[PDB]
Amino acid sequence: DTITLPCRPAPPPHCSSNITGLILTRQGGYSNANTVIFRPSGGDWRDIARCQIAGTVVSTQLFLNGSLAEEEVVIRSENWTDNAKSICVQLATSVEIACTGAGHCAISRAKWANTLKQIASKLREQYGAKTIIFKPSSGGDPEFVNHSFNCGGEFFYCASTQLFASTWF
Amino acid sequence: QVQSVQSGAEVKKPGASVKVSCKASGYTFTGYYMHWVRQAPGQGLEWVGWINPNSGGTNYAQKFQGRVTMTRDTSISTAYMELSRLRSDDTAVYYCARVSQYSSGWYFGYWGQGTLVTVSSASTKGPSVFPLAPSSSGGTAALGCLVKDYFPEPVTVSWNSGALTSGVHTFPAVLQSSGLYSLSSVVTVPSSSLGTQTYICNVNHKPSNTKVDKKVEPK
Amino acid sequence: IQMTQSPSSLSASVGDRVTITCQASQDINNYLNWYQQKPGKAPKLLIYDASNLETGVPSRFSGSGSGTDFTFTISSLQPEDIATYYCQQYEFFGGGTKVEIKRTVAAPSVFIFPPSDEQLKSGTASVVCLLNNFYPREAKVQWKVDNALQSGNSQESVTEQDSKDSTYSLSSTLTLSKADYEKHKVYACEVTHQGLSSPVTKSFNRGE
Ligand SMILES: *[C@@H]1O[C@H](CO)[C@@H](O)[C@H](O)[C@H]1NC(C)=O
Ligand SMILES: *[C@@H]1O[C@H](CO)[C@@H](O)[C@H](O)[C@H]1NC(C)=O
Ligand SMILES: *[C@@H]1O[C@H](CO)[C@@H](O)[C@H](O)[C@H]1NC(C)=O
């Protein structure tokens, strides 16, 4: 099984990249029970630039063809208690995202769940032994609510909703 | 004067939605996050969420995750909050505030004047006035008027066409379970003036175009 | 984060030293803000980062603390400092501490009002209890119908502090239907207050 992301327009097969990290936003307020919630980033291009882990490809939510980590995935933030400060994730094993050309890009479901569990484990280090929950983007302009990226004189908009819908105890 | 101006007070039925505006006067949004904080009539401050004006991204409190939506209009420097599926618990004053994007902490500044949102199933209704007749404390007797079943606020109550203003204690209105407001306006007068002085309360309800004058007689 | 701000309310004279404490449950370092909200207005920042003073705030205001224990102090209370003060750290606010004015103790004058027949014609009956000009606000009103304690049918209303004698006033309303008002005969509201040695009761019988 794979995870399908609807894109617009249809990215050609040569726009397939490697997910080398992502950018997150922690949901605030009085949390309930044993859960901490994370979504795609609610910031602008400032939050993506603060990472300095991306390559030549401009991209939101997911970093494509960027910098990998040495051994394990590693996360940074200016302030872990400020939810207005985004959480930068740098993977150690890149996830292949391959587009068919008919409007759907695909991602291995098992390898994505594999990296999400590594992310959730590293997030429990910064917020205690809690349940990690990933949820879709809260909203924003089409450039930031979708996984947007440029590829050879183009700019695509891919809904990343199916990527953020898991729970980790 | 640099300030944040908000839309006027609103009344909504339970289950409906309300959209509150927060327009920047003398400044722009590009360097700040806009936060929304609400305060129930007698309660403390509660944070609702923030919005990124450059991207439209948001981060709502988990309490309002499924029902609140924040947008902004950069061309007019106005932030919006729309709360859907309103319930009686949502009756509060909703503020907007400025927080620097480049700041290490949250320093709420340049608050709006506040927006009173009242959730009630009632329609605009004029108030019924009933007298509180004095009866058998010392040299001072107490009399008043009972203003029940009206919506929405406010009602102005004067005594003797505005001539009697000493010893008048007009209590804040209370929202009843029926969805209507009710207050009491009392005044302490010497017991000698009863029977020799005519006491009339003048109630004015501008939302319903109703003015009622009630003379309060003893025994 | 849990914000415990104490006390909930306090009364002080003009010129006394007011001290408000906000203590967090977790190590927040030196970052803690203090807001002042006068009635009807929006909160206003006075102290940021526990000890620093925002521009334009008088020097009588001060704050201190680090880690989890923080204090907010007003050196010399002024007639423009009566308000509710909140501690804030990110999205979490303290419960608030309302500043009140201290005067001598005053016993409330209690009155009772039977429902007027003009209201009896409408199908509802409202009984009103009054506590005029008293201090402190801390009071207790109990409605007794046929010498039976009533609950769920009472509504209270407190006036704001008087600017002249610095007292409060109280109105408790007991709302019953006409059919239920005509049943029981005797109605009374019992009041307990510091200024009263024993609880005071005002009562009437329906139809007298
Ligand atoms: C990432 O690199 C691969 C390999 O060179 C390339 O084919 C692909 O187009 C790149 N992705 C983007 C979005 O440019
Ligand atoms: C992505 O990484 C894989 C190994 O995980 C590598 O074979 C491939 O060349 C990289 N780039 C693309 C565009 O697949
Ligand atoms: C977050 O910022 C505040 C205020 O600058 C500071 O006190 C606190 O230590 C910071 N926390 C972290 C984890 O950096």
Numbering used by the authors:
A (entry chain M): 1 to 169
B (entry chain J): 1 to 52, 52A, 53 to 82, 82A, 82B, 82C, 83 to 100, 100A, ...
C (entry chain K): 2 to 91, 96 to 213
What does the report in the manuscript say about this coordinate set?
Here, we report on structural characterization of vaccine-elicited VRC01-class bnAb precursors in the IAVI G001 Phase 1 clinical trial with the eOD-GT8 60mer nanoparticle as immunogen. The engineered outer domain (eOD) germline-targeting version 8 (eOD-GT8), which was designed to activate VRC01-class germline-precursor B cells specific for the CD4bs on HIV Env, exemplifies this strategy. VRC01-class B cell receptors are defined by their specificity for the CD4bs and by using heavy chains derived from variable (V) gene alleles IGHV1–2*02 or *04 paired with light chains containing a five-amino-acid LCDR3 (4, 5, 32, 33). High-resolution X-ray structures of eOD-GT8 monomer complexed with Fabs of five VRC01-class bnAb precursors with >90% germline identity revealed a conserved mode of binding to the HIV CD4-binding site (CD4bs) via IGHV1–2-encoded heavy chains, mirroring mature bnAb interactions.
Two versions of eOD-GT8 were used: eOD-GT8-mingly, which represents a minimal glycan variant of the antigen used in the trial, and eOD-GT8-mingly-N276, which includes the conserved N276 glycan so as to evaluate its accommodation by the VRC01-class bnAb precursors. Notably, the VRC01-class bnAb precursors accommodated the N276 glycan, a key barrier in HIV Env recognition, through structural rearrangements in HCDR3 or LCDR1, despite its absence in the immunogen. A key feature of VRC01-class bnAbs is the ability to accommodate the heavily glycosylated HIV Env surface, particularly the conserved N276 glycan. While many mature VRC01-class bnAbs achieve this by incorporating deletions or flexible residues in their LCDR1 loops, the G001 trial-derived VRC01-class bnAb precursors remain near-germline and generally lack such characteristics. Unlike mature bnAbs, the precursors have an intact germline LCDR1 with the glycan positioned between LCDR1 and HCDR3. Our structural analyses suggest that the N276 glycan can be accommodated without requiring LCDR1 deletions or hypermutations observed in mature bnAbs.
